Amino acid sequence: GTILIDLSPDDKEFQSVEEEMQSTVREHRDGGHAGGIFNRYNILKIQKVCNKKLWERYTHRRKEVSEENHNHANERMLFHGSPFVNAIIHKGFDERHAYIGGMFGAGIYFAENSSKSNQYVYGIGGGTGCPVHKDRSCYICHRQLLFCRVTLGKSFLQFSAMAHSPPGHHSVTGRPSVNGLALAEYVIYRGEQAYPEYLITYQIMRPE
Numbered sequence: 001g002t003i004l005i006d007l008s009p010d011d012k013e014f015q016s017v018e019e020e021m022q023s024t025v026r027e028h029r030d031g032g033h034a035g036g037i038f039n040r041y042n043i044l045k046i047q048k049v050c051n052k053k054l055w056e057r058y059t060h061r062r063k064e065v066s067e068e069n070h071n072h073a074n075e076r077m078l079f080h081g082s083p084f085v086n087a088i089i090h091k092g093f094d095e096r097h098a099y100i101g102g103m104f105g106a107g108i109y110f111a112e113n114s115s116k117s118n119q120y121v122y123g124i125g126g127g128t129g130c131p132v133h134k135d136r137s138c139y140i141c142h143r144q145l146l147f148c149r150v151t152l153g154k155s156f157l158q159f160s161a162m163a164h165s166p167p168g169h170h171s172v173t174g175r176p177s178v179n180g181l182a183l184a185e186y187v188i189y190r191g192e193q194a195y196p197e198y199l200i201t202y203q204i205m206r207p208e
């Protein structure tokens with residue numbers, strides 16, 4: 001039941017999603033090993049993901065969380081990078097999209113930094129890179145990220161350098177505690193707590 005609607009670049013919605021993508025790029029502590037070397041992206045396409053069943057699944061769970069947290073869903077817009085983008089947009093998030101080995105346990109991981117999610121497009125640690133050239137820093141091959149609506153509810157704060165949420169909590173927040181430029185990362189343990197709202201097609205750009 002999924003349909004994808006192209007946004008025109010003249011559309012304010014295209015422009016505000018592109019700006020969130022571009023403005024949350026940072027340098028990474030691997031020097032670009034996992035995700036490539038770049039300071040900005042070439043945005044090729046932005047599509048709205050429309051699936052009524054998956055949306056109602058999201059809003060149902062959002063209401064449950066909100067009612068457990070003084071009518072506050074604590075909803076964010078966050079990036080997700082994955083080799084399974086194309087299954088996610090058709091079937092929704094579930095246990096098969098969890099990062100089993102993540103530092104906050106087996107859950108589904110999201111980032112404020114678009115460049116963090118970019119490290120996972122070709123797999124954990126960037127895998128072996130693009131399928132065509134085996135290059136984690138490929139400037140040619142098209143990449144895709146999701147920009148997702150995520151319900152955090154009461155989030156457990158972890159200060160730092162499928163499983164269950166900590167008791168009394170609906171998510172985990174990974175707060176950066178060394179790299180002063182890093183933005184937060186978040187983990188949910190229920191696939192229903194996220195909706196893949198935008199599919200973004202891009203390339204990383206080689207710095208001049």
Ligand SMILES: COc1cccc2c(=O)[nH]c(-c3ccc(Cl)cc3)cc12
Pocket residue numbers: 079080081082083097098099102103109110111116117118120123124185186
């Ligand atoms: C530190 O983890 C993360 C931190 C921040 C963001 C992400 C992210 O966007 N995706 C992923 C990810 C996706 C698919 C698999 Cl199979 C594994 C991991 C991780 C991840």
Ligand SMILES: [Zn+2]
Pocket residue numbers: 130131132133134135138139140141
């Ligand atoms: Zn390539």
